[PDB]
Amino acid sequence: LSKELLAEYQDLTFLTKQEILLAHRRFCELLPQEQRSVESSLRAQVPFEQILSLPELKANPFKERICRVFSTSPAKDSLSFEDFLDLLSVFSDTATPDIKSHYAFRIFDFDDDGTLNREDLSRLVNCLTGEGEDTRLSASEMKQLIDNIL
Numbered sequence: 359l360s361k362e363l364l365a366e367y368q369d370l371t372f373l374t375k376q377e378i379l380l381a382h383r384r385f386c387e388l389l390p391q392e393q394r395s396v397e398s399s400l401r402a403q404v405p406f407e408q409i410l411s412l413p414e415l416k417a418n419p420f421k422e423r424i425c426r427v428f429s430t431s432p433a434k435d436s437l438s439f440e441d442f443l444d445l446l447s448v449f450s451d452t453a454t455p456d457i458k459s460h461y462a463f464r465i466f467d468f469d470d471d472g473t474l475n476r477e478d479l480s481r482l483v484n485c486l487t488g489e490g491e492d493t494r495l496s497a498s499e500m501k502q503l504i505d506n507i508l
């Protein structure tokens with residue numbers, strides 16, 4: 359489903375509390391001492407440089423998409439508390455795969471036109487099949503199969 363499903367989650371609290379505890383400390387480890395107080399973390403965002411610690415984003419080198427797409431801020435390089443938590447919630451593959459699809463989709467979808475564009479289409483079957491590997495090789499054959507399923 360579209361942001362319609364997640365829209366209901368964020369507007370709620372599907373996010374656990376324990377995970378938050380870790381963020382308060384575990385993360386404050388990379389944040390200055392004068393910021394160790396979660397009090398300044400609710401307004402302060404996590405610098406991209408430090409975010410490199412979160413493997414969740416490792417999915418794509420230039421997470422620049424996570425900042426702008428996942429978060430709506432001018433910096434576009436500092437995960438803010440706001441969504442940060444909401445991310446862990448929506449990132450819950452509890453329900454069917456549909457939820458997961460939205461997770462990886464929105465993240466991989468930088469344009470967000472309403473479907474998988476050449477941009478996502480690649481990064482997509484790329485991670486699954488494995489760009490430049492055994493599966494599909496260097497070529498446009500990615501259209502033959504993708505078109506065979508559609």
Ligand SMILES: [Mg+2]
Nearest residue numbers: 467470473475
């Ligand atoms: Mg797209």
